[PDB]
PDB file of C-alpha atoms in Angstrom:
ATOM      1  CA  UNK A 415      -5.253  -2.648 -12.898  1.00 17.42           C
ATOM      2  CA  UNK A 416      -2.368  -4.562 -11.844  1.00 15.94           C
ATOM      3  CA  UNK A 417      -3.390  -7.697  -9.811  1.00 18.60           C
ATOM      4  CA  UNK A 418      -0.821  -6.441  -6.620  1.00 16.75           C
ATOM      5  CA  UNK A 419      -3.233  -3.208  -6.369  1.00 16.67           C
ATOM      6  CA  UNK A 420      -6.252  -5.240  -5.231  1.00 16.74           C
ATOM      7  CA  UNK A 421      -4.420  -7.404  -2.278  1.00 15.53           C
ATOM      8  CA  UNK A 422      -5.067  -6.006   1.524  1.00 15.22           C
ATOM      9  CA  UNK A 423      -2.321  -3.998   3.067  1.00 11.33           C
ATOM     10  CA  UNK A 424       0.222  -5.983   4.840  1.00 13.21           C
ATOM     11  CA  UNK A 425       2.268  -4.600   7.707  1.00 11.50           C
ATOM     12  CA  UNK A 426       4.119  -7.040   8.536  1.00  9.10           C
ATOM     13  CA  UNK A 427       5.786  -8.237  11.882  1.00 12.21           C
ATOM     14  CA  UNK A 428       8.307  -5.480  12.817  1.00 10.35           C
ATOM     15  CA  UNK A 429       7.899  -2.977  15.223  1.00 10.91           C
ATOM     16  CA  UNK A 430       8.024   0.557  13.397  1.00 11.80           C
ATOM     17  CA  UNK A 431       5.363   2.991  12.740  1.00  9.84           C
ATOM     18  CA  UNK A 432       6.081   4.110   8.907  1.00 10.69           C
ATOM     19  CA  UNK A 433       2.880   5.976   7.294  1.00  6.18           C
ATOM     20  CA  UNK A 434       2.563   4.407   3.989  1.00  2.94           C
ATOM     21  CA  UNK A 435       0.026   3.974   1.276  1.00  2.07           C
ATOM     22  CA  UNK A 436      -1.691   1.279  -0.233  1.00  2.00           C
ATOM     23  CA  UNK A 437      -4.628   1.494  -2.983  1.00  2.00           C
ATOM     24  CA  UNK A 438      -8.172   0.355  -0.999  1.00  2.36           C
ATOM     25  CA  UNK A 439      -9.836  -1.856  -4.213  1.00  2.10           C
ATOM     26  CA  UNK A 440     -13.523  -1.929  -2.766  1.00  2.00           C
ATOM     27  CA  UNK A 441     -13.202   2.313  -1.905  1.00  3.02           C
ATOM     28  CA  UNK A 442     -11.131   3.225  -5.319  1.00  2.00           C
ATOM     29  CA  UNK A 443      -8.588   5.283  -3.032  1.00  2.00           C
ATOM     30  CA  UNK A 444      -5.216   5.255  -1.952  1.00  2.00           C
ATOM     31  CA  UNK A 445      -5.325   5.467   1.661  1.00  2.00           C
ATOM     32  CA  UNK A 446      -2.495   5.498   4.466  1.00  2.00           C
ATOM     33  CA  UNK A 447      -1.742   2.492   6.618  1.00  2.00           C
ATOM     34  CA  UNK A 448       1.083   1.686   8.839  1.00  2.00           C
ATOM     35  CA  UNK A 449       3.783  -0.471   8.374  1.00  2.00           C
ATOM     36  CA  UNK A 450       6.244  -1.969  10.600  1.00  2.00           C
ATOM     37  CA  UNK A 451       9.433  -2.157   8.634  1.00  2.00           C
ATOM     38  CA  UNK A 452       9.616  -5.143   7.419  1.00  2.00           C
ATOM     39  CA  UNK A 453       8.655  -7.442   4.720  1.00  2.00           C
ATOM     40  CA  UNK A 454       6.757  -4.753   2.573  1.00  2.00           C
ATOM     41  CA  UNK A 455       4.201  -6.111  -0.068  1.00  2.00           C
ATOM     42  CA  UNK A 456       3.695  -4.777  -3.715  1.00  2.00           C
ATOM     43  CA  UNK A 457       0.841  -2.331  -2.326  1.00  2.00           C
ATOM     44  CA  UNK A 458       2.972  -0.310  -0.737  1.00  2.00           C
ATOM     45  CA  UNK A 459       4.009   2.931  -1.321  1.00  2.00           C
ATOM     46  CA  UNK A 460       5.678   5.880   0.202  1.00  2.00           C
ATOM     47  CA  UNK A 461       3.121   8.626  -1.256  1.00  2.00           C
ATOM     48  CA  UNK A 462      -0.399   9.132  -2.961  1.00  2.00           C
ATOM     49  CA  UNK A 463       1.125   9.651  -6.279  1.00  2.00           C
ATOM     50  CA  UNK A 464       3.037   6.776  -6.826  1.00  2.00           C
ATOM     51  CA  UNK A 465      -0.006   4.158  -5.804  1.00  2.00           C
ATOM     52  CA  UNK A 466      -2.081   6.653  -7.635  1.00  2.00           C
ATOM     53  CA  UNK A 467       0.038   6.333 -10.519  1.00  2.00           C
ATOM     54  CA  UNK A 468       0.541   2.594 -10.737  1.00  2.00           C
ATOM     55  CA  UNK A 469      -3.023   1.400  -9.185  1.00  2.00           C
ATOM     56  CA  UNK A 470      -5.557   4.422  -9.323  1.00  2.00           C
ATOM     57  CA  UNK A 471      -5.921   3.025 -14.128  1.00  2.00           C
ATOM     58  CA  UNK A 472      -9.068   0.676 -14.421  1.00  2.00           C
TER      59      UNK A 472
END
């Protein structure tokens, strides 16, 4: 699994509420976190099927 897919979701310093995903390591499952708008990490994503797609492969 890529190494990106196993660091903790970072939302960053900006003030917006965006609903995005990041893959949870330790539960197997992308899950939704909020970011702020700024500054997005790798494990990021704006749907289940994309972090599915590039971080839900052993």
């Amino acid at each position: 699994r890529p190494d990106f897919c196993l660091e903790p979701p970072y939302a960053g310093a900006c003030r917006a509420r965006i609903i995005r995903y990041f893959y949870n390591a330790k539960a197997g499952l992308c899950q939704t976190f909020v970011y702020g708008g700024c500054r997005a990490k790798r494990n990021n994503f704006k749907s289940a099927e994309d972090c599915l797609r590039t971080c839900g492969g052993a």
